Design a protein around this ligand. Structure first.
Ligand SMILES: [Cl-]
Ligand SMILES: [Cl-]
Ligand SMILES: [Cl-]
Ligand code: NA
Length: 129
């Protein structure tokens, strides 16, 4: 599913991301824009052999099992394919574990490089939330 900006802001808000570990909703919308273009089916190979899955590009090195990432963990206890569903529940639950890990949203490279420090409230501007 390719979410609209506001549609995704609403889903993320419904699933409890707004202010989760102190990250305002716009941080999560920004991160999803640059990680997946709001596409739940997005998959991207990393240089290390891991792959990133879904709207928040969750990595098979640590968080989900894809059967092809040596010496990885599955800390969200889920098949990576579950992170591609039109329903963002699994991606949200897994992102809550990630952002609680110690480095906050820095875990998302695109957030660090493209969202952090910026006016992230612009991403929920005009949305009925
Ligand atoms: Cl993509
Ligand atoms: Cl694996
Ligand atoms: Cl980046
Ligand atoms: Na894995």
């Amino acid at each position: 599913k390719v979410f609209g900006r506001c549609e995704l802001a609403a889903a993320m808000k419904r699933h409890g991301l707004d202010n989760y570990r102190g990250y305002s909703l716009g941080n999560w919308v920004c991160a999803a824009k640059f990680e997946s273009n709001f596409n739940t089916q997005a998959t991207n190979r990393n240089t290390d052999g891991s792959t990133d899955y879904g709207i928040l590009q969750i990595n098979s090195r640590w968080w989900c099992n894809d059967g092809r990432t040596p010496g990885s963990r599955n800390l969200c206890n889920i098949p990576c394919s579950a992170l591609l569903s039109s329903d963002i529940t699994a991606s949200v639950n897994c992102a809550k574990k990630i952002v609680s890990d110690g480095n906050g949203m820095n875990a998302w490279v695109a957030w660090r490089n493209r969202c952090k420090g910026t006016d992230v409230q612009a991403w929920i501007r005009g949305c009925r939330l």
